[PDB]
Design a protein around this ligand. Structure first.
Ligand SMILES: *[C@](=O)([C]([C][C][C][N]C([N])=[N])[N]C(=O)[C]N1C(=O)C([N])=[C]N=C1C1=[C][C]=[C]C([C])=[C]1)C1=N[C]=[C]S1
Length: 237
């Protein structure tokens, strides 16, 4: 996260850090708890991943330092990538992780509500992007979960900032015309929490962007609401 600040412990209980154990354990991507056994994240986060066996999901984490060999974690039983996904920049950057065991909800870990179709007209004025990603280009995973408030921008406005790309309605962007605050390498799969009516909503999933926090280069996110039907279909046994 660029231009952000340290999060308060438990402030974003749906945020999880997804690790890979190969070759050695390290943070790979962010993710959001949306069910007792489901993590919603980015599909482009599994590039080079042949098996869910090397994945580990940690919930209720603030500092990566809390993660040691003796720290409990959730195994991943199955990785579900949207069948239309090809690459982050083309859209459909959405994936579901089915955990091997269920998450016991607590103040440190609980699920975030998915947006409803009857909310595409809602004016989210209080949105935040969170993660352990870079604070800039060519950096490294940060220890303390970072947070940054960032305004959503219209699709028409985002398209202007990304000529050469096709910003569809299944994407949503956010950022400052002047840059300064934004997601970065490592925040991928992270949630884009929007506070609307004393209630948090998973509006987007950190997907891509040109560089990090550059001026006139909004972060691009998966427009979650466009996938509630997909999410329902894939999570029902
Ligand atoms: C991510 O967290 C990053 C976050 C980048 C978001 N940046 C801004 N300014 N909002 N995601 C990517 O690197 C995804 N990505 C791109 O954004 C671009 N421009 C080109 N390629 C990719 C990409 C696609 C598939 C696989 C990879 C490794 C990169 C991370 N996601 C994985 C590691 S860090």
């Amino acid at each position: 996260i660029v231009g952000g600040t340290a999060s308060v412990r438990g402030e974003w209980p749906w945020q999880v850090t997804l690790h890979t154990t190969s070759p050695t354990q390290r943070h790979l991507c962010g993710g959001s708890i949306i069910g007792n056994q489901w993590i919603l994240t980015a599909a482009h986060c599994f590039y080079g991943v042949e098996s869910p066996k090397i994945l580990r999901v940690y919930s209720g984490i603030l500092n990566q330092a809390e993660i040691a060999e003796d720290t409990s974690f959730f195994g991943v039983q199955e990785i579900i990538i949207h069948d239309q996904y090809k690459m982050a920049e083309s859209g459909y950057d959405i994936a579901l992780l089915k955990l091997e065991t269920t998450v016991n909800y607590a103040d440190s870990q609980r699920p975030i509500s998915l947006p409803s179709k009857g909310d595409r007209n809602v004016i989210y004025t209080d949105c935040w992007v969170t993660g352990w990603g870079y604070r800039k280009l060519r950096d490294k995973i940060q220890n303390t979960l970072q947070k940054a408030k960032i305004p959503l921008v219209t699709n028409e406005e985002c398209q202007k900032r990304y000529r050469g790309h096709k910003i569809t309605h299944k994407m949503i962007c956010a950022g400052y015309r002047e840059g300064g605050k934004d997601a970065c390498k490592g925040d991928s799969g992270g949630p884009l929490s929007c506070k609307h009516n004393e209630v948090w909503h998973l509006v987007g999933i950190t997907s891509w962007g040109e560089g990090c926090a550059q001026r006139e280069r909004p972060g691009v996110y998966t427009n979650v609401v466009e996938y509630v039907d997909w999410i329902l279909e894939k999570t029902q046994a």
